[PDB]
Design an enzyme around this catalytic site. Structure first.
Site, PDB file in Angstrom:
ATOM      1  CG  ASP A  35       3.709   6.707  -4.777  1.00 29.04           C
ATOM      2  OD1 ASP A  35       3.300   6.152  -4.105  1.00 29.04           O
ATOM      3  OD2 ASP A  35       3.933   6.401  -6.156  1.00 29.04           O
ATOM      4  CB  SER A 199       0.164  -6.036   9.869  1.00 27.14           C
ATOM      5  OG  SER A 199      -0.699  -6.194  10.602  1.00 27.14           O
TER       6      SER A 199
END
EC number: 3.4.23.22
Length: 330
Positions: A35, A199
């Protein structure tokens, strides 16, 4: 040194991925959920409340000759999906894919929430976010990666998650045969303890690319792709019959649909998520309404590039003094 371990979807939907981890001496192998959105290595154990164990493999520290109780240490964590666990702490030898760390903090669960109990396939979590998020008190502990870093050939790990198929976590090296083209690297902020990056935009299907900054985290422990409501609405508008359902808890779509791809930007590069990756199947057994793999982050407080996004790429988690993230197509 290096390590290399195969990671395997837990079910036919790729709801999560498990990777075998050797703990203790002799080795006790547990299948852990790696994770990159948290920083605790915790396991089901011989100390876990019996009624809260349902088929998991447990770590028994008393059977490990290298286990030592970390005196006075406790831990307690709550995850973004509302699940939680807590317990005490041992140090022990931990190996992943041939890479060994001695003195790793292994957090032994005394209590776990229902969602963990109900998932027989996950024996615990191995956190790979920054150690500043580790919950051990009163002395915070380091992640497996943080402990291994100095010994690694290169201070990196890579995630290569499969779509409906096994993939690989590598430590200490970049497998240049595992991706196509070039790896594009992008800046990371560690201020929230996550692999947080921005992004450069998105496209829906064969549509034009929209240049827009989307700050979010690369999180292997989250199943879906969570993005701003504007982006998600634009995606699902291209699927006939798709709607946001408050009763279900997100966007659903007719199971008869053919889903469009979703592209996200990494610098000037582009990662394409095929439409099929966005199908999470019937909302309930036998239903013709299917759950979407792209969902709104509104009310989470952060955008999350979860497995739906990451499994479309070869992802480098570069733990150099100034961390960065790399993405390649594959």
């Amino acid at each position: 040194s290096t390590g290399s371990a195969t990671t395997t979807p837990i079910d036919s939907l790729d709801d999560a991925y498990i990777t075998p981890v050797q703990i203790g001496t002799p080795a006790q192998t547990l299948n852990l959920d790696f994770d990159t959105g948290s920083s605790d290595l915790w396991v089901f154990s011989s100390e876990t409340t019996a009624s809260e164990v349902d088929g998991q493999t447990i770590y028994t520290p008393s059977k490990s000759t290298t286990a030592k109780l970390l005196s006075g240490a406790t831990w307690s964590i709550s995850y973004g999906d509302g699940s939680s666990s807590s317990g005490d702490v041992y140090t022990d030898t931990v190996s992943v894919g041939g890479l060994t760390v001695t003195g790793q903090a292994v957090e032994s669960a005394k209590k776990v929430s229902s969602s963990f109990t109900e998932d027989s396939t996950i024996d615990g979590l191995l956190g790979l976010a920054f150690s500043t998020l580790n919950t051990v008190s009163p002395t915070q502990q380091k992640t497996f990666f943080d402990n291994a870093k100095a010994s690694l050939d290169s201070p990196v790990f890579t995630a290569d998650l499969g779509y409906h198929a096994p993939g690989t976590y590598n430590f200490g090296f970049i497998d240049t045969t595992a991706y196509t083209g070039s790896i594009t690297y992008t800046a990371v902020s560690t201020k929230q303890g996550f692999w947080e990056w921005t992004s450069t935009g998105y496209a829906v299907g064969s549509g034009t690319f929209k240049s827009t900054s989307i700050d979010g985290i690369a999180d292997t422990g989250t199943t879906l792709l969570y993005l701003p409501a504007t982006v998600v609405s634009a995606y699902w508008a291209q699927v006939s019959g798709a709607k946001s359902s408050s009763s279900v808890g997100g966007y659903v779509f007719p199971c008869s649909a053919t889903l469009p791809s979703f592209t996200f930007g990494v610098g000037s590069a582009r990662i394409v998520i095929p439409g099929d990756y966005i199908d999470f199947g019937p909302i309930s057994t036998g239903s013709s309404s299917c759950f979407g793999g792209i969902q709104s982050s509104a009310g989470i407080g952060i955008n999350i590039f979860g497995d739906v996004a990451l499994k479309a790429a070869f992802v480098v988690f570069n733990g150099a003094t100034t961390p960065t993230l790399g993405f390649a197509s594959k």
